[PDB]
Structure 1
């Protein structure tokens, strides 16, 4: 079966993509990572030795190498990578013009993924594999009031095109999920200060959350399993672009 790495799997669309992968195919193996062990254990308990995980922050290169080494050690190869920064959540000082906070958010949403692709790339070359990015719909970047939360998340869009131009033995695609990726579980509101999210950002964020997926998760899952078509290699698309019709449920 295909060996697929998936990041950001604790919540939101990353969790759904794991769920969908296992329902689509009986042979696929998934190695996931998230920062919290609880939901990784729950996935391991549900899916058994179809699922393996590393716990930690992918802004640590050591965590990335653990995850890549664990897949090659345990199953001998890597077919695909579903590169996902995970759900939107408030991060300290991002609503300020604060280079330290911006660098930290760009490392969460963009550079850790660049680092992971670089680390996994030699295995992906071996299988002529696929890199599927879970990017953001906020390509209305045109106008966006999401500040650094939006620009850092959307940086994967151009990255897909650059990776596919530069590395011809692999394919890459960036797909927007038609929603703002948030934790879907009913949660107590958190006390979020204005240096972290503007009042508007917080109010929309809560609205969206208190409103929120299997359909776009399937698109990502089918691209990772069956491969990216040549005609969309390098591109960034909504999950509902007609060029993706064969990757729908």
Structure 2
């Protein structure tokens, strides 16, 4: 139950949206731990800089494959390519998101659809492609979410929708993996305000709250994934840690788990 950096030594890990912010910080922590890494985002130049520094930090191997997660064909092929480079896969870290600003919802259906496609559907496409390799290694799926993916906030309607969707989908397949004895863990990471450049610019003059450090955030995600934890909670406030968990949800899920006859599947 206690974490050690040696747990990630020689592990074959994918980090999406790893050119900046939390994703890059995760690549850096994995490198130091002596893991095999394959990073992705759209910018080739930004990913080149992460691979170079990953090798310097002591990564067992570091590679990149640039491309958009709007392209479900790219998302699918990226996983077959990344597992080929590493000789398999132990951990899939799903972190990328479509660029989003704090705004009231009026009529931007294109932004609602794009948020669902990039923040949620590509995650499903990446999971389908990664599952054969993860089944073989008894691996981990790590889903980076937000507090806006557990509670309601204004100015993020489309973003909150795609984040809530991740919880619904991945919590459902976790229950399916439990009964169909698929030894692949699913870690949902619920994150508060992080001091990344994009987030700090987004909240500027609108939201006034304490920002947690991105370096530590990235580590707590890796920690939970390695410990095969169902959910990881990371925020500045003490109060969030105290009230974010839903004890009644897990109790309800436990009572229903007895009633679902699936010995036909």
Render the CA deviation track for 1:166-225: whole Å, top value 9, x for unaligned: 223211020113325743699xx7xxxxxxx9xxx77437x679997212211112234x
Q: Does 1:213 align with 2:214?
A: yes
Asked if structure 2 preserves the Cα contact closer than 8 Å seen for 1:53 and 1:67, the reply is no
1:50 Cα shift?
2.2
1:89 Cα shift?
3.2
Question: For 1:38 and 1:125, how far apart are their aligned partners in 2?
Answer: 33
Asked if structure 2 preserves the Cα contact closer than 8 Å seen for 1:9 and 1:86, the reply is no
1:136 corresponds to which residue? 146
Question: For 2:166 and 2:197, how far apart are their aligned partners in 1?
Answer: 21
1:66 Cα shift?
3.1
1:36 corresponds to which residue? 43
Structure 2, unaligned runs of 5 or more? 1-9, 236-240, 243-265
Superposed counterparts of 1:108-187, under 5 Å: 108-139=118-149, 141-167=151-177, 168-179=182-193, 182-183=196-197
1:239 corresponds to which residue? 234
Question: For 2:150 and 2:224, how far apart are their aligned partners in 1?
Answer: 24
Question: For 2:199 and 2:154, how far apart are their aligned partners in 1?
Answer: 26
Q: How many residues align?
A: 220
Aligned mate of 1:84, from 73, 90, 95: 95
What is the root-mean-square deviation of aligned Cα atoms in Å? Answer: 3.2
Structure 1, unaligned runs of 5 or more? 190-196, 243-249
2:127 aligned counterpart, secondary structure: helix
Asked if structure 2 preserves the Cα contact closer than 8 Å seen for 1:12 and 1:87, the reply is no
Question: For 2:176 and 2:75, how far apart are their aligned partners in 1?
Answer: 22
1:4 Cα shift?
0.6
Greater relative contact order (CA < 8 Å, ≥ 6 in sequence): 1
Structure of higher CA gyration radius: 2
